[PDB]
Amino acid sequence: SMEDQEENTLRELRLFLRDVTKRLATDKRFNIFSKPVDIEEVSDYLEVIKEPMDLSTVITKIDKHNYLTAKDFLKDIDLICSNALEYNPDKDPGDKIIRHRACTLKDTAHAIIAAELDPEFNKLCEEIKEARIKR
């Protein structure tokens, strides 16, 4: 029942991470990140990007209990952004549009968590993460 109680708290994190992801997913600036990059229309992607990531894959990850902290979640947002920048590094203002969007997706996600996540709640998640490592 410690397990039961721990699951309630992780559950509360998931509810919170779904609300955030949802606010990112419906912001029309982050449309290009809302879905996995198509290996039809963009055939060179999995050739250059080694770990693809997107807002809809993140939703799936929340539901598979892949995130026990807000930080594990932000890593994957960070990953969305670092891939954008790796695959789109050019002088062409199409690249710069995409990069500006990547960087704002990241910063927006970080400021949401920072403003809205109660710190003690986060500390509690961290120990549950750690306390599970140790089992």
From Swiss-Prot:
Residues 2-116 form the Bromo domain. It comes from the Eukaryota. The chain holds residues 952 to 1085 of 1458 of the full protein. The lineage of its organism: Eukaryota, Metazoa, Chordata, Craniata, Vertebrata. Belongs to the AAA ATPase family. Signal peptide: none annotated. Residues 2-24 form a coiled coil. It comes from Homo sapiens (Human). This is ATPase family AAA domain-containing protein 2B. It is found in: Nucleus. Binds acetylated lysine residues in histone H1.4, H2A, H2B, H3 and H4 (in vitro). The gene is ATAD2B.
